[PDB]
Write a protein that binds this ligand. Structure first.
Ligand SMILES: [Mg+2]
Ligand SMILES: [Mg+2]
Ligand SMILES: [Mg+2]
Ligand SMILES: [Mg+2]
Ligand SMILES: [Mg+2]
Ligand SMILES: [Mg+2]
Ligand SMILES: [Mg+2]
Ligand SMILES: [Mg+2]
Ligand SMILES: [Mg+2]
Ligand SMILES: [Mg+2]
Ligand SMILES: [Mg+2]
Ligand SMILES: [Mg+2]
Ligand SMILES: [Mg+2]
Ligand SMILES: [Mg+2]
Ligand SMILES: [Mg+2]
Lengths: 64, 152, 103, 384
RNA sequence: CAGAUCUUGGUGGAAGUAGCAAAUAUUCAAAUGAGAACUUUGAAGACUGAAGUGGGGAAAGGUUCCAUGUGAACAGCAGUU
RNA sequence: GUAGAGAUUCUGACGUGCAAAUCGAUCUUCAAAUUUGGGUAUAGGGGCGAAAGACUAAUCGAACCAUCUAGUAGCUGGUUCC
């Protein structure tokens, strides 16, 4: 399957970079059928597509 | 179409050919020269061994700059290579000739490669860009291949 | 009998001893495959992604000198006459151990 | 203008790879019939190098009766086994081998020399010849008789006991060793009596003897003229490289001359080095191999940790002064000298004062395990 | 017509040669597929490091945009893109 | 001294190139006689020139296009069967 479009749409819907989109690797078939922003929104609600957390950048050493 | 030879009984032989095949003419000639005369089953074994780098195709005519290998020893040469792209086309053509022979009911145990010939097909043209705003040829050298297998 | 699992320590340091830094971790992967191919006599070798993580844990240049590996020879989902090895990592305190059979 | 000698010797040409590894005796010493029957050469294995201290006995020298330090080379020389004889007839086209007579039994290591895959073979190498030996024992004696009647030159076929060394190679080295001494009949009789018998190093050479060493040098691969021939480095500014010769010839002759330095093979070449002095012929059976009259410590000739890339020398050995061709573990041919020696340096008796046995795998400071244990006391591992 | 550094076209030896080496760097598993070093997904390792390899515009292009398919030619290796 | 603007040296790389002028390092200038977009004017014996005969679309001690023109050549090359 080719999920390039879904990855792009999910980044728009989640309001994040493509680098933060996580698509469930065990649900490729369901994800590939989306094609619509409304379908992507259902994937997000169902937990098949999520926004990954920001990469860690801690200020502890800097404050110390 | 006419094959370049009929060195066998028409009723006890089979034929296969490929035209305008985009694989190197010079490499294909070396493959053809090596498998010509072989038994069909051993030709398949040898071709698979070339794929695995267990045996090599001696380059006898188009050998300018070809490297040396201990796998040329069995043919008494030092220059040999493993042209797998040409090997694959020959493997498919040999499979086609085998199926053609199975269609004519030949005894699929005495089949010998009796004839194999590579002819240079019309070249396909690309361009390459050279220093000082020049352009020179970047051609391909495709091949016509014909095979005749026959009972020994 | 054919299906068998053993734990091995691979001395990776001597196999990477002069290797260009950009090639060390990718070379370590090839060495593990060749190691399993030799030990289990299986052409097909599969590397657990978690084991790929252990090899690359310190980046591309600094592969651990020794790795404790679990080699499992299994039957593939193709025709059952095909055997392949699955290579995984073993978390141990000191990798300086002998080969041990895993039951 | 601004003369300089040419780089390198035209006597060592071509600088191709040697066609051999063993080391070939090109010329045996002139035969004297008045002497007893003896061997003129031996085969050994380069174990490694160390250094000694000895008192110099050289009147007129500033170091007379003073201590000097000298590098030495240790060659492992277990006894060779005589397995055959070859007779040569003098002809107007040179020496010609008339016939060759072999022993009834040959060990496995020498029979491996006749095979590329001994293991996969049927081991049929001297099986029919051996049966001839035990049928009537008459064609053997006839072949030997023909060497006596003809054959002005007699050489024994001798092979090494390489299995006694730590080398991984099991195939023994075999060579013709000319028999010099009294009478062709006595040479043949001496040879027949030594069939399947060992000849050891102390029966061939002696302490203080001056010998020659023949071997194939260390492989170097290709080298440019700078290192192959010693040509001058061209300036830093040189476009297209500086490790070369600037002008490889004139106009006319319109050809590159054979005397011009060229890049090519720089090693693995056959060399016979003359005048190596035997400082010691060690015995493999005695535990004071490396002891002296001044260093009484019971130690053998193997450094701490073993000879690097060789192992432990448990057999007889020779301790030649200086260097020899070839790397550690290459087989070396020791040959009797063709020259006569009367110089004070050649004739001086050599008595070693101390032989270094510290590790050569680093900056080793202890000669023996006992010295290390005493200096350091006890360690965490030593207690338990 | 043998010539004119002749004209136009075709085709050689040089040759399976020169070479296809700037811009740090890739790896594991899965899916798809006749075929995967190059597609997609997940994981790891990295880089641009805000005077960006980020986000927009002016000029210029003109459909290159998007979806679904294809994979002859082109993408100087490959091709399921 | 950075961005920007240059281009000294290596007489470095490259020199059938990444490139019909580029690449690296080094170097010059860096708040003004500064750098620059767009609009606008000047056209070939003309323009424009802090002047090198420079620049005027890879063209300059007189651009480019077509025509006069199949320009003339005491000069070079060729000039076809027995
Ligand atoms: Mg030709
Ligand atoms: Mg070459
Ligand atoms: Mg180019
Ligand atoms: Mg220069
Ligand atoms: Mg050392
Ligand atoms: Mg003509
Ligand atoms: Mg003419
Ligand atoms: Mg011409
Ligand atoms: Mg090449
Ligand atoms: Mg950086
Ligand atoms: Mg960074
Ligand atoms: Mg954008
Ligand atoms: Mg230059
Ligand atoms: Mg005219
Ligand atoms: Mg004219």
């Amino acid at each position: 399957a080719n999920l390039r479009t879904q990855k792009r749409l999910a980044a728009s819907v989640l309001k994040c970079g493509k680098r933060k989109v996580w698509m469930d690797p065990n649900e490729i078939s369901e994800i590939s059928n989306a094609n619509s922003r409304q379908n992507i929104r259902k994937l997000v609600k169902d937990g098949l597509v999520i926004r990954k957390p920001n990469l860690m950048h801690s200020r502890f050493r800097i404050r110390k | 179409v006419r094959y370049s030879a009929s060195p066998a009984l028409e009723t006890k032989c089979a034929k296969a050919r490929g035209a305008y095949l985009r694989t190197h003419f010079k490499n294909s000639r070396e493959v053809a020269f090596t498998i010509n005369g072989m038994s069909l089953k051993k030709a398949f074994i040898f071709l698979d061994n070339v794929k695995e780098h267990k045996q090599a195709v001696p380059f006898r005519r188009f050998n300018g700059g070809v490297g040396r290998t201990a796998q040329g020893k069995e043919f008494g040469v030092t220059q040999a290579r493993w042209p797998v792209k040409s090997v694959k086309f020959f493997y498919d053509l040999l499979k086609n000739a085998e199926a053609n022979a199975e269609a004519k009911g030949l005894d699929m145990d005495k089949l010998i490669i009796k004839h194999v010939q590579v002819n240079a097909a019309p070249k396909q043209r690309r361009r390459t860009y050279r220093a000082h705003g020049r352009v020179t040829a970047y051609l391909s050298s495709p091949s016509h291949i014909e095979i005749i297998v026959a009972e020994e | 009998n054919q299906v068998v699992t053993r734990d091995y320590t691979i001395h990776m340091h001597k196999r990477l001893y002069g290797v260009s830094f950009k090639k060390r971790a990718p070379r370590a992967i090839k060495e593990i495959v060749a190691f399993a191919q030799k030990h289990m006599q299986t052409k097909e070798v599969r590397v657990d992604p978690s084991l790929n993580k252990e090899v690359w844990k310190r980046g591309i240049r600094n592969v651990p000198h020794r790795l404790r590996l679990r080699l499992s020879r299994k039957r593939s989902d193709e025709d059952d006459k095909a055997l392949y090895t699955y290579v995984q990592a073993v978390d141990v305190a000191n990798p300086k151990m002998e080969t041990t059979v895993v039951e | 203008k601004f003369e300089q000698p040419r780089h390198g010797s035209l006597g060592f040409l071509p600088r191709k790879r040697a066609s051999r590894q063993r080391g070939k005796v090109k010329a045996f010493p002139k035969d004297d019939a008045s002497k007893p029957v003896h061997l003129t050469a031996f085969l050994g294995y380069k174990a490694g190098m160390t250094h000694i201290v000895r008192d110099l006995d050289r009147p007129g020298s500033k170091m007379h009766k003073r201590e000097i330090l000298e590098a030495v080379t240790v060659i492992e020389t277990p006894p060779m086994v005589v397995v055959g004889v070859v007779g040569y007839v003098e002809t107007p086209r040179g020496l010609r081998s008339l016939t060759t007579v072999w022993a009834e039994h040959l060990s496995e290591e020498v029979k491996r020399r006749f095979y590329k895959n001994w293991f996969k073979s049927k081991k049929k190498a001297f099986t029919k010849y051996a049966k001839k030996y035990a049928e009537s024992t008459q064609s053997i004696n006839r072949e030997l008789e023909r060497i006596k009647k003809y054959c002005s030159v007699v050489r024994v076929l001798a092979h090494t006991q390489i299995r006694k060394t730590p080398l991984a190679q099991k195939k023994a080295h075999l060579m013709e060793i000319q028999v010099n001494g009294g009478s062709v009949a006595d040479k043949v009789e001496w040879a027949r009596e030594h069939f399947e018998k060992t000849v050891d190093i102390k029966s061939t050479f002696e302490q203080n003897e001056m010998i020659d060493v023949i071997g194939v040098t260390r492989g170097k691969g290709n080298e440019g003229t700078t290192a192959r021939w010693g040509t001058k480095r061209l300036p830093r500014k040189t476009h297209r490289g500086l490790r070369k010769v600037a002008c490889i010839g004139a106009w006319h002759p319109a050809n590159v001359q054979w005397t011009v330095a060229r890049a090519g093979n720089a090693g693995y070449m056959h060399r016979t080095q003359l005048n190596s002095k035997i400082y010691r012929i060690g015995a493999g059976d005695d535990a004071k191999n490396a002891s002296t009259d001044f260093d009484a410590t019971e130690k053998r000739i193997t450094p701490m940790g073993g000879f690097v890339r060789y192992g432990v020398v448990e057999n007889d050995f020779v301790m030649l002064n200086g260097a020899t061709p070839g790397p550690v573990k290459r087989v070396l041919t020791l040959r009797k000298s063709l020259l006569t020696h009367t110089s004070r340096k050649a004739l001086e008796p050599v008595s070693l004062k101390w032989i270094d046995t510290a590790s050569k795998f680093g900056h080793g400071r202890f000669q023996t395990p006992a010295e290390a244990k005493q200096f350091l006391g006890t360690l965490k591992k030593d207690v338990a």
